[PDB]
Ligand binder design. Structure first.
Ligand SMILES: OC[C@H]1O[C@@](CO)(OC[C@H]2O[C@](O)(CO)[C@@H](O)[C@@H]2O)[C@@H](O)[C@@H]1O
Ligand SMILES: OC[C@@]12OC[C@H]3O[C@@](CO)(OC[C@@H](O1)[C@@H](O)[C@@H]2O)[C@@H](O)[C@@H]3O
Length: 480
């Protein structure tokens, strides 16, 4: 990957809420030596959200005691008593290697988050795991993980949300050590499944109003919805979360944007948040990937994106996405191609593997319009991004690679007005990925794609009528 974060070696997994110290974002992420094997937390820092400097393990795997996901916060006021400005993290670990004993352990750092000391006793104990007995009780006790810490400024206390089976649990604390159980968050459509890597935060909308957001990684493939990040805007009163609407909204419609996490931007923490996710899906994450053989590592994170909350007619709010601004600093070349009308297919006179391409497509009677990236000259390999019916789809099927096929998870789709006869696309292509930001960023589709060395072409196509492709600009991306 030219511009996506990958671990120096080994298996990469869930990212953890970055903390800002030493004038940089300290990113933690699950890492193991063996694919899908036991591991812990590794450290990487970034000052712009594009380039990462890896620092190794901070919270190591220990005999039958792996470190699972959680989150880290900067205790500025020294509320926990480990010193002002100390970095405190909570993470789930299976006590005694027992799955039904998974609970929250606290780790702390007094050097900006480069070295951590473990607090021997868990701050939030899995009591269900000790009293469980029936098959249901066990299953319930075996889903008590991924704590996300947030400072409820209005109440002057800490609030933590923990993922569970089809519901979320909440705890409050004045020192990050002593927690008090609160009211759970329940939602009606369990076919949405989930509640892994929950997220809880406050953000100011474009109208100046303050809002709470509760989100989590889901699995709604069964009912035709994403397996990415779903969120509920609302409010937290100190006892429970009140969702404005129980039907969640989605942050990504692609195949690979899992365990995503968000964090305040250094420049505008109240209105602009940054977000990153693991580019994988458990439907197939447990396997070898091309990079295992070529470079001895498995997994990459998504591009970092910026998030803002925008008011919608009727008083509701939605999130908007856009690639992190600094990526502009890694552009090594900018190519513009002439507008053109296509009726059938046309190959563009450009080739590459790491770049961002923007374009506008307008049509009338065509029942299908789109663009192919990672197109091999033999014409057999390519990933298609286009508009059909009420879908803005991304079909990676033709890019399936022998030995690493992603079938049958080929055609991803985001909703788009059926009446749309024009669309703007912003597409980020790298050696093992494709990320599509549609129109104003309300919908995004992120997917890993195993491109072959020669999958460098780009073509345009339409079915049932001509289309006008304009504003074509290709920005090549390297390192700089
Ligand atoms: O089994 C989940 C289901 O049970 C409910 C009952 O209302 O809550 C159970 C759950 O609440 C806790 O006290 C807090 O996390 C747990 O100890 C207990 O298992 C529902 O809220 C939930 O849907
Ligand atoms: O659903 C859109 C899609 O399927 C329709 C159709 O169009 C063709 C030919 O252009 O493939 C291109 C894309 O159009 C495909 O990747 C999308 O899923 C044709 O092969 C396919 O039957």
């Amino acid at each position: 990957a030219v511009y996506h974060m990958t671990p120096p070696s080994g298996w990469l997994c869930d990212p953890q809420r970055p903390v800002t110290t030493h004038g940089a974002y300290q990113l933690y992420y699950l890492h193991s030596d063996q694919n899908n094997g036991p591991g812990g937390w590794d450290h990487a820092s970034t000052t712009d959200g594009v380039a990462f400097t890896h620092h190794g393990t901070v919270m190591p795997l220990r005999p039958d005691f792996p470190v699972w996901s959680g989150s880290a916060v900067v205790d500025t006021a020294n509320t926990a008593g480990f010193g002002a400005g100390a970095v405190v993290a909570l993470a789930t670990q299976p006590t005694d290697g027992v799955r039904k004993y998974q609970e929250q352990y606290l780790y702390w750092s007094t050097d900006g988050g480069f070295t951590f000391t473990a607090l021997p006793d868990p701050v939030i104990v899995n009591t269900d795991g000790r009293a469980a007995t029936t098959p249901a009780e066990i299953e319930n006790a075996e889903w008590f993980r991924d704590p996300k810490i947030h400072w409820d400024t209005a109440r002057g206390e800490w609030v933590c949300v923990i993922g569970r089976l089809r519901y979320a649990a909440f705890y409050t604390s004045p020192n990050l050590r002593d927690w008090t159980l609160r009211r759970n968050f329940d939602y009606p459509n369990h076919a949405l499944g989930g509640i892994e890597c929950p997220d809880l935060f406050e953000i100011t909308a474009d109208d100046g109003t303050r809002h709470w957001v509760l989100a989590a990684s889901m699995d709604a493939y069964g009912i035709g919805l994403p397996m990415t990040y779903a969120y509920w805007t609302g409010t937290w009163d100190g006892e429970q979360f009140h969702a404005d609407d129980l039907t969640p909204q989605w942050l990504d419609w692609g195949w690979d944007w899992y365990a995503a996490v968000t964090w305040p931007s250094i420049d505008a923490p109240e209105t602009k948040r940054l977000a990153i996710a693991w580019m994988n899906n458990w439907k197939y994450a447990a396997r070898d990937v091309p990079t295992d053989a070529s470079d001895g590592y498995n997994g990459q994170n998504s591009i970092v994106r910026e998030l803002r909350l925008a008011r919608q007619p009727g008083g509701w709010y939605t999130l908007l996405s856009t690639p992190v601004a600094a990526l502009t600093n890694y552009v090594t070349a900018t190519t513009t191609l002439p507008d053109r009308t296509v009726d059938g297919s046309a190959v563009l006179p450009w080739n590459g593997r790491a770049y961002e391409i923007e374009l506008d497509i307008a049509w009338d009677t065509a029942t299908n319009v789109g663009i192919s990236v990672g197109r091999s000259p033999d014409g057999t390999r390519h990933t298609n991004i286009g508009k059909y019916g009420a879908d803005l789809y991304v079909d990676r099927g033709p890019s399936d690679l022998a030995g690493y096929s992603l079938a049958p998870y080929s055609r991803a789709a985001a909703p788009i007005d059926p009446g749309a006869r024009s669309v703007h696309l912003r597409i980020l292509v790298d050696t093992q990925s494709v990320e599509v930001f549609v129109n104003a960023g309300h919908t995004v589709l992120s997917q890993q794609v195993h491109f072959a060395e020669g999958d460098t072409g780009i073509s345009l196509y339409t079915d049932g009528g001509p289309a006008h492709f304009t504003g074509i600009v290709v920005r090549e991306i390297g390192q700089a």
